[PDB]
Amino acid sequence: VPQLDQVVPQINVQVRIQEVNERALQSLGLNWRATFGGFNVAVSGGTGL
């Protein structure tokens, strides 16, 4: 009995959960159309020449 009735420790536990996210985007595009004699040229990004 003296051993099973002793004081046991009391504790406080701290947990920290930390989460960080970052992003970065960068677009750039030229999209033209030229018309000289007889010719018709169109340059884009989706379709090419």
Partner: peptide, 29 residues
């Protein structure tokens, strides 16, 4: 037989109860 084992979760105590030979075997483990 085999020695009686008593486990207390609150105090983390192991209690072995048996013949003196059966108790010295747990004591060395």
């Amino acid at each position: 037989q085999q020695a009686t084992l008593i486990a207390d979760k609150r105090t983390n105590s192991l209690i072995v109860r048996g013949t003196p030979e059966q108790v010295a075997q747990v004591a060395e483990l």
